[PDB]
From a paper:
Schroder et al. discovered that GS-441524, a metabolite of the anti-SARS-CoV-2 drug remdesivir,12−14 binds SARS-CoV-2 Mac1 with an affinity comparable to that of ADPr. Interestingly, they found that the cyano group of GS-441524 similarly occupies the oxyanion subsite by interacting with the backbone NHs of Phe156 and Asp157. Thus, it appears that the oxyanion subsite of SARS-CoV-2 Mac1 is a “hot spot” for binding that is not utilized by ADPr but can be actively incorporated into the inhibitor design. We wanted to explore whether converting GS-441524 into the corresponding NDPr (3) would further increase its binding affinity for SARS-CoV-2 Mac1. To understand how NDPr binds to SARS-CoV-2 Mac1, we solved the X-ray crystal structure of SARS-CoV-2 Mac1 in complex with NDPr using diffraction data to 1.4 Å. As expected, the binding pose of NDPr is well-aligned with that of ADPr, except that the 1″-CN group of NDPr forms hydrogen-bonding interactions with the backbone NHs of Phe156 and Asp157. Compared with the co-crystal structure of SARS-CoV-2 Mac1 with ADPr, the nearby β7-α6 loop moves significantly to allow interactions with the extra cyano group of NDPr, a feature also seen in the binding pose of GS-441524. We were pleased to find that biotin-Ph-ADPr and biotin-NDPr are ∼50- and ∼70-fold, respectively, more potent than biotin-ADPr based on the Kd values, demonstrating the beneficial roles of the 1″-OPh moiety and the 1′-CN group in binding. A good dose–response curve of Ph-NDPr with Hill slope of unity was obtained using TAMRA-Ph-NDPr as the tracer, yielding IC50 of 3.1 nM, which was 6000-, 500-, and 100-fold better than ADPr, Ph-ADPr, and NDPr, respectively, measured under the same assay conditions. Interestingly, this cyano group is detrimental to the binding of human MacroD1 and MacroD2.
Macrodomains are a class of conserved protein domains present in various cells and some viruses with diverse biological functions. They have been characterized as “readers” or “erasers” of protein adenosine diphosphate ribosylation (ADP-ribosylation). Viral macrodomains that can bind to or hydrolyze protein adenosine diphosphate ribosylation (ADP-ribosylation) have emerged as promising targets for antiviral drug development. Many inhibitor development efforts have been directed against the severe acute respiratory syndrome coronavirus 2 macrodomain 1 (SARS-CoV-2 Mac1).
Numbering used by the authors: 3 to 169
Write the structure that this text describes.
């Protein structure tokens, strides 16, 4: 459980690896995997779609029940649902959609949700379909999260760019 290997250490508590988050989940057996979600938990073409496909759509069905019962999340908020076959829990976190003009300051609130869990496998929030500057997302993570976060960045071009400017 929580057996993370091959990650580069960025700070005392933040680590990064060039990998698919789904493949990492199957190897590391994490207590918590983080999804980069929207307020409707409608799992689209990035990390959310990859995680969902790996559960054979069970994540989406559970998400449909959560949303019908509780209504949409707020931007910067989160909820904990099952991790199905990938993890004990999935922490669904909503970063701001910068492509739709949502406030970038909400990325700090988004990463604050990680602080409620001792160890997480996670993606870089808002850095794909939501269009935020990935260098900013990584630095906000580093400056906000105090628990142990292992970031899986599937895009090798981006991984190399983040590592080169960070170290
Ligand atoms: N690298 C990388 C990626 C990425 C893509 C696929 C994978 C993978 N299999 N393993 C690891 N990483 N990874 O991880 C980052 C997050 O990008 P992502 O688009 O998921 O999140 P976001 O918060 O921007 O947008 C939320 C909306 O996207 C809908 O999926 C969802 O339902 C919401 O509507 C980007 O750098 C992205 O290139």
């Amino acid at each position: 459980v929580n057996s993370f290997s091959g990650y580069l250490k960025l700070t005392d508590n933040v680590y990064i690896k060039n990998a698919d988050i789904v493949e990492e989940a199957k190897k590391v057996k994490p207590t918590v995997v983080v999804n980069a979600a929207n307020v409707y938990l409608k799992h689209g073409g990035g990390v959310a779609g990859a995680l969902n496909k790996a559960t054979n759509n069970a994540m989406q069905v559970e998400s449909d029940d959560y949303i019908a019962t509780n209504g949409p999340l707020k931007v910067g908020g989160s909820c904990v649902l099952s991790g199905h076959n990938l993890a004990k829990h999935c922490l669904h976190v909503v970063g701001p959609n910068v492509n739709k003009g949502e406030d970038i300051q909400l990325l700090k609130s988004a990463y604050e949700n990680f602080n409620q869990h001792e160890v997480l496998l996670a993606p870089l929030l808002s850095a794909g379909i939501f269009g935020a500057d990935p260098i900013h997302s990584l630095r906000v993570c580093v400056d906000t999260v105090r628990t142990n976060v292992y970031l899986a960045v599937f895009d090798k071009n981006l991984y190399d760019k983040l590592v080169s400017s960070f170290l």
